[PDB]
Structure 1
Amino acid sequence: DAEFRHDSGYEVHHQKLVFFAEDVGSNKGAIIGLMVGGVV
């Protein structure tokens, strides 16, 4: 995207498991079926 992202960690006293999945999905811009510049 036209902007950024961020993340942060820091400590813990025991075991830690982390799973991260960002932005699942097709589109982030524009989807166009058909465009016509001009007819007659």
Structure 2
Amino acid sequence: GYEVHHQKLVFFAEXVGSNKGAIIGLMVGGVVIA
């Protein structure tokens, strides 16, 4: 059981060519990349 709160997140991204993965600011869970 996850409990996430009170986050102030700022995400800057520049030049994202041909992205094939995950670009995530805030994530609460699992990540599976093959």
TM-score by length of 2: 0.23
Structure number with the bigger relative contact order (C-alpha 8 A, sep ≥ 6) is 1
How many aligned residue pairs are there? 32
**Identical aligned pairs, as a percentage?**
97
Consecutive unaligned residues of structure 2, counting only runs of 5 or more, are none
Q: Return the TM-score normalized by structure 1.
A: 0.21
Of the two, which has the highest radius of gyration? 1
Q: Of Structure 1 and Structure 2, which has the larger fraction of its residues in strand?
A: 2
Post-superposition shift, 1:36?
3.2
